[PDB]
Design a protein around this motif. Structure first.
Motif, PDB file in Angstrom:
ATOM      1  N   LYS D 101       0.778  -1.230   0.000  1.00  0.00           N
ATOM      2  CA  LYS D 101       0.000   0.000   0.000  1.00  0.00           C
ATOM      3  C   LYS D 101       0.815   1.289   0.000  1.00  0.00           C
ATOM      4  CE  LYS D 101      -1.284   0.076   4.907  1.00  0.00           C
ATOM      5  NZ  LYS D 101      -2.192  -0.602   5.822  1.00  0.00           N
ATOM      6  N   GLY D 102       1.998   1.251   0.607  1.00  0.00           N
ATOM      7  CA  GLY D 102       2.882   2.375   0.581  1.00  0.00           C
ATOM      8  C   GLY D 102       3.188   2.775  -0.833  1.00  0.00           C
ATOM      9  N   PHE D 103       3.516   1.784  -1.662  1.00  0.00           N
ATOM     10  CA  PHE D 103       3.909   2.058  -3.038  1.00  0.00           C
ATOM     11  C   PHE D 103       2.698   2.600  -3.791  1.00  0.00           C
ATOM     12  CE2 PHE D 103       4.273   0.865  -7.444  1.00  0.00           C
ATOM     13  CZ  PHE D 103       5.429   1.532  -7.804  1.00  0.00           C
ATOM     14  N   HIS D 104       1.520   2.000  -3.562  1.00  0.00           N
ATOM     15  CA  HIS D 104       0.326   2.409  -4.267  1.00  0.00           C
ATOM     16  C   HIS D 104      -0.053   3.835  -3.927  1.00  0.00           C
ATOM     17  CE1 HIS D 104      -0.741  -2.123  -4.050  1.00  0.00           C
ATOM     18  NE2 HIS D 104       0.058  -1.870  -5.071  1.00  0.00           N
ATOM     19  N   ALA D 105      -0.033   4.136  -2.625  1.00  0.00           N
ATOM     20  CA  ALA D 105      -0.389   5.469  -2.127  1.00  0.00           C
ATOM     21  C   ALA D 105       0.567   6.486  -2.703  1.00  0.00           C
ATOM     22  CB  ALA D 105      -0.341   5.491  -0.620  1.00  0.00           C
ATOM     23  N   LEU D 106       1.837   6.132  -2.714  1.00  0.00           N
ATOM     24  CA  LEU D 106       2.846   7.036  -3.251  1.00  0.00           C
ATOM     25  C   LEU D 106       2.515   7.414  -4.702  1.00  0.00           C
ATOM     26  CD1 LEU D 106       5.374   8.613  -2.639  1.00  0.00           C
ATOM     27  CD2 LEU D 106       6.696   6.588  -3.370  1.00  0.00           C
ATOM     28  N   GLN D 107       2.135   6.426  -5.523  1.00  0.00           N
ATOM     29  CA  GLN D 107       1.881   6.687  -6.945  1.00  0.00           C
ATOM     30  C   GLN D 107       0.544   7.406  -7.151  1.00  0.00           C
ATOM     31  OE1 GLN D 107       4.565   6.393  -8.547  1.00  0.00           O
ATOM     32  NE2 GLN D 107       5.458   5.340  -6.775  1.00  0.00           N
ATOM     33  N   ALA D 108      -0.442   7.013  -6.347  1.00  0.00           N
ATOM     34  CA  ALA D 108      -1.674   7.766  -6.270  1.00  0.00           C
ATOM     35  C   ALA D 108      -1.417   9.228  -5.887  1.00  0.00           C
ATOM     36  CB  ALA D 108      -2.663   7.102  -5.300  1.00  0.00           C
ATOM     37  N   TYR D 109      -0.434   9.502  -4.996  1.00  0.00           N
ATOM     38  CA  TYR D 109      -0.069  10.908  -4.671  1.00  0.00           C
ATOM     39  C   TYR D 109       0.364  11.631  -5.941  1.00  0.00           C
ATOM     40  CZ  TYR D 109       3.596  14.480  -4.424  1.00  0.00           C
ATOM     41  OH  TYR D 109       4.442  15.556  -4.750  1.00  0.00           O
ATOM     42  N   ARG D 110       1.229  10.994  -6.707  1.00  0.00           N
ATOM     43  CA  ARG D 110       1.730  11.610  -7.929  1.00  0.00           C
ATOM     44  C   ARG D 110       0.585  12.017  -8.846  1.00  0.00           C
ATOM     45  NH1 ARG D 110       6.645  11.324  -7.112  1.00  0.00           N
ATOM     46  NH2 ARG D 110       7.734   9.439  -6.278  1.00  0.00           N
ATOM     47  N   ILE D 111      -0.467  11.208  -8.933  1.00  0.00           N
ATOM     48  CA  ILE D 111      -1.591  11.570  -9.814  1.00  0.00           C
ATOM     49  C   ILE D 111      -2.290  12.806  -9.249  1.00  0.00           C
ATOM     50  CG2 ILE D 111      -3.670  10.823 -11.040  1.00  0.00           C
ATOM     51  CD1 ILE D 111      -0.855   9.359 -11.636  1.00  0.00           C
ATOM     52  N   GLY D 112      -2.662  12.771  -7.976  1.00  0.00           N
ATOM     53  CA  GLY D 112      -3.257  13.947  -7.326  1.00  0.00           C
ATOM     54  C   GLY D 112      -2.368  15.193  -7.366  1.00  0.00           C
ATOM     55  N   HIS D 113      -1.052  15.002  -7.324  1.00  0.00           N
ATOM     56  CA  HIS D 113      -0.137  16.119  -7.441  1.00  0.00           C
ATOM     57  C   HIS D 113      -0.278  16.727  -8.811  1.00  0.00           C
ATOM     58  CE1 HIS D 113       3.185  18.696  -6.485  1.00  0.00           C
ATOM     59  NE2 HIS D 113       3.852  18.314  -7.554  1.00  0.00           N
ATOM     60  N   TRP D 114      -0.137  15.897  -9.847  1.00  0.00           N
ATOM     61  CA  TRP D 114      -0.323  16.360 -11.214  1.00  0.00           C
ATOM     62  C   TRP D 114      -1.667  17.094 -11.387  1.00  0.00           C
ATOM     63  CZ3 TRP D 114      -3.737  15.352 -15.272  1.00  0.00           C
ATOM     64  CH2 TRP D 114      -3.380  15.985 -16.485  1.00  0.00           C
ATOM     65  N   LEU D 115      -2.746  16.492 -10.896  1.00  0.00           N
ATOM     66  CA  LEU D 115      -4.072  17.120 -10.959  1.00  0.00           C
ATOM     67  C   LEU D 115      -4.097  18.500 -10.312  1.00  0.00           C
ATOM     68  CD1 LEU D 115      -6.277  14.043 -10.244  1.00  0.00           C
ATOM     69  CD2 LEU D 115      -6.219  15.363 -12.397  1.00  0.00           C
TER      70      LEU D 115
END
Lengths: 251, 255, 251, 252, 255, 253
Positions: D101-115
């Motif tokens: 989940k750490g890895f998933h959350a991290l990559q999900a952060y990147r999407i929200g960051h871009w957004l």
């Protein structure tokens, strides 16, 4: 191209019509550059199941559309067919969003493509999901063409060796089914322009000539010539239809 | 007969698992992971009948109970598989009915509701009867008495009512109704006898025999009894002949 | 409405004890409600629910319609009574409400009808087609259908834009009250008070079916049909006169 | 990015045979994709999916972001490598992608960051909070986080609006890079390249953590922390200097 | 310690079934319909671990396999139930852990992944380990060696790493980490011995003993070994005393 | 105060409906289609608590019952919204807590289980308590007595036990435990008084006061009582000071 701009047009208006469904109209129609994308979206949603999720189905549909783009074309003709021939349908978007006949038809095209590629196990899987989900049972090996309308659709059956040519129109409960326990040609070859009415049953390897009209309720055991109105149970010729191609009129 | 059919299913499954990677785990889940047909059947029924009200896991407990209590149901189903494979030229595999064909699924779901109804568990039987209608488009009342070696090809639209009987080696198609007449309880559904074929979109109403080996044509609406070894047809149904085989269920001559 | 509602509740208490697995179901659908209108919105919300519109959201819509036209609830109580007497398979006021797709589709029609009255066409169409997929009963929201109706079994029923069905009608699986033409306007049957239609009838175009007639099973009815007449055959000629005034009540 | 992706695919073929129940899963998530970017959109779509936004719809958004800023995919490949070496529990390039989940959350952060960079705040917030509920990691989209990061275990991580995390950082369960005040503006840590933070640290306000420092487990860090220093205690004083240049790589 | 516990569950269930109509079928489905605890456990684990990738029905097959192959897991879980009931003053019922408590569920899910890992079925064990992290917020590596009579009260945030050991009659709270040190494989996780309590938000790192009967403080960060019958505490952890009972796990004297 | 907060939510919602097409129907379904806050709250709780065992539709019936029976819950929640908006500098909107923040959701879900427990519907209260733990990572026993204007910012890891009290205008962060000691029933959980802030990863154990306006530091483990207007901290917790405001909950220093 022109059909796709009307869909998009209608969608913008509907998005304002009904707030509950804005995001739906946006997700299904407005967010796509073209019809092919709206179709993979819709097929993915409508075929999705725990065994194959929308996301995975979409990959398959996109593969098929990449490999045989004329499917997308076929489907645009299927949209036009419904809009004119269905007086209940006043919009290029209604078949795409809502009509199981249209969905089943396009789902057939995917299973057909799969079967062409020898991917039988998948084609069969989808064929039967479509039966359960849309109440339309079309064998993937059937050869169906563009500008087709399955209005209402509940109960349609179309078997392994059938052919339906361009500009045909079919209704609920129509069976283009076979006879025998033996493999080989045993399903109707329905030719360009035919209408078939509700609850017809057309059995075995028999022509239905280019422009004929099968009446509602009819059970058609022998060939039927072009430009002829068959009817009765079993079917004798009672007539000749009022137009060249009775599929366009729905008399 | 049940051991040999089951090894072909398993055989076909191993090949399909390699045929289509997307569905390996599906073939493994539905077929390869089971020691016998009864297990594959409870699996399939549980998945296909599952609903928020009764989840797969809970349905499976019920199906396993019934198969423990009346194992001939599993036997019946193996005859139902064989029936389809021979009679359906579209079906070239012992596994196709089990995986994919709503007629076969509805048929087996009927057997569970039947067993339930025999045990006086009416509320459940009715629940399932109607879910199967919605899910598979086949409406069979649990109180109906249906036998082995049956084929509901295509199946969309089949109706079969409270007091009906279908005997062994029958074949039925889409839209067939073995329905009743009256507002009154009691015998009012067909007793269809061993060997009959019924074609697409027949409607056979009231308490009437259909003799052992008859053939009801497609589209036919059958209000009076029909004798053995007779081809009925027309709307309403008169006798237009005698069929081309002893048991026209095995052949499917719709001509 | 009050008479039965107490029978439903009564039956529910007994069933709750009959079948432990379904206690909470009987409680959720029937016992927890003060009246029929609430059990109806509950059932419609569950049965119409979809990712696009969840039960909770559909229920808001149904409650709106019942607040705005309470005679719907009344209509549905007559629909329950109709089934109980006319269906010898149904011995309980609760069976249609819980289990019978004909009854559910019928009530779902009433919601889409109300929506269409209010000019909320986009929604009405959405629901019409979900009901087709979910219950196999295609109906157009613009149809004018009345109380004390029974769609027994239902799989395959179609009823089109301009149809009318009056009070005390009874219809079976595969019946089509469908239309003809490529053109909008009156093209669907006007079925009058008291008619029975048997399994797999097809009644096409704008034609009366007089007050008390009886359409036989399998029948394909292209011309008007007078009151108190038994039509039949494909196509339909008059083979007699029915055994009761209103053959819908007798079957 | 090419070499990591071939190991994933390699491992996947073996696992597909290891566990029949999960064949189609391994095929769906890993084997059916030409590259890492596709496996990432797949995974994010499945893991972020909800009735409000289905996998299919999320995937379109993720693919948009990866088309618009491809270095995200690159970032994630460094995040994979980071975990494999630094986590002795993880012996496979595919484990973070499938399971952590750490890895998933991290990559999900990147999407929200871009957004959030694109001003699509309402969505970024929606996802931020779905990720909190789904993965128990609450990272504000406006945070500036870099490549080669590892959120091992991850349950309980919080990272606030104005935080920065630079390349080659390693963080554990319950770490909070949280803020102070009722007022907007810089109030979250700027964690610099090479830091490790241990389980259940709490690092509050706008404070540097110098390039190569090591925050101990349990530590509550109210003042700045210099490079190449081991802080610890509640609240945090300096108890030493770490055993390596960049203690993120070691996890001492 | 099974069988008597199971009759209380069943007892409590009958009463609750009457208490709350909305949940009758739930109590019936999870508890009353089963002959024994092992069945209620496979049910519970199947429902709680279910996901589109592995459905309840499929998980249940796996859990039943493990319980058939190592029945002492069921035994272990019954001791885990007893542990909670006495030690949790919030829990007044033998059924509460089984129905409702994520600590208990995660614990039993660990046992399945442990069994799987013993059988070399690592890929699955890992899959479940991480689903349990997401679903229950408890991250326990399958290779850990955990014993009977354990309580993970509240549980949100527990982490337990590859080489840890927890022996019988231990009690642990929210946010406890039995985590490791290094980038290298090998023994690097605590060996927590029989009778220990660990309070909320402890962090116990590296390969260190915690002697038989010790008591870890809440918030404590424990870097060095801790002897039997000792109360450690502080950040980092020094000895501030000796606990008030032989086995402070049974009491939960958090002072 | 409940009318004006509700009009801002509705206001924000229309703007957001235009901001993000994918979520229009979401904003409409959760906020715009409701006459008042109580309806938006039952909607949200029903969706967020829904499970195969109890579907949204069934939960909503329960929540509406509670709001009909004790309307001050809705009031409490409006104060909980205001609390977050001011105290959270990350939150610039009256609608953010309602749509998105698990702290806020868990808090309101507590109120329903509390009401249920007052009505002796313990089996349900417990069911919900534990679903909320799983779904939102917040474990609050229904029997706890919690008041209005509360903020559980981030929230992952909060525990609050049977006999705890939290009074009005309190603010709590991730991992805070208001937990107990003993195997024996009776008062064994903190009584946290009006105005307190508790920082990330505190652990406050047994039956101990925390005086009206105190400030518990992050990481702190608090075994003894703590007087009003005092800053406790350390593990275990000794007094390192006095806070910079009367009620440090409002400031988050």
């Amino acid at each position: 191209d022109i059909v796709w701009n009307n869909i998009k047009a209608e969608a913008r208006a509907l998005a304002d019509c009904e707030p509950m469904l804005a995001s739906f109209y946006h997700a299904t129609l407005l967010k796509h550059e073209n019809l092919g994308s709206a179709l993979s979206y819709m097929l993915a949603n409508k075929l999705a199941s725990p065994i194959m999720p929308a996301i995975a189905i979409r990959e398959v549909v996109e593969e098929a559309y990449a490999a045989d783009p004329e499917m997308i074309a076929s489907a645009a003709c299927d949209i036009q067919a419904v809009r004119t021939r269905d007086p209940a349908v006043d919009k290029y978007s209604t078949p795409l969003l809502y009509l199981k006949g249209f969905h089943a038809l396009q789902a057939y095209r995917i299973g057909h493509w799969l079967w062409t590629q020898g991917r039988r196990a998948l084609a069969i899987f989808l064929q039967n999901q479509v039966s359960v989900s849309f109440q339309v049972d079309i064998h993937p090996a059937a050869k169906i063409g563009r500008g087709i309308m399955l209005d209402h659709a509940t109960g349609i059956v179309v078997g392994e060796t059938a052919v339906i040519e361009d500009d045909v129109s079919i209704l609920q409960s129509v069976t283009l089914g076979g006879t025998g326990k033996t493999s080989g040609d045993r399903h109707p070859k329905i030719r360009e322009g035919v209408m078939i009415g509700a609850g017809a049953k057309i059995l075995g390897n028999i022509e239905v000539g280019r422009g004929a009209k099968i009446g509602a309720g009819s059970v058609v055991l022998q060939p039927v010539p072009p430009h002829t109105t068959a009817a009765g149970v079993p079917a004798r010729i009672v007539g000749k239809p009022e137009s060249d191609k009775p599929a366009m009129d729905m008399d």
